[PDB]
Symmetry: C2
Amino acid sequence: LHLEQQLYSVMEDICKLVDAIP
Amino acid sequence: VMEDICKLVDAIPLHELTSISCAKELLQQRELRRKLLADS
């Protein structure tokens, strides 16, 4: 199940992106 | 989890998405988190 680990850190790049108005 | 946030990021309209400069690359995170969810 290499697809769950791939979604664990690919929608974690969308979040850190949300962080960049600090 | 943390992605009830990203639930709100797949919802920003395409007209309202041009006002942020990170969107060139952080909208391919939207269209890729949707092909991977679809691989059930």
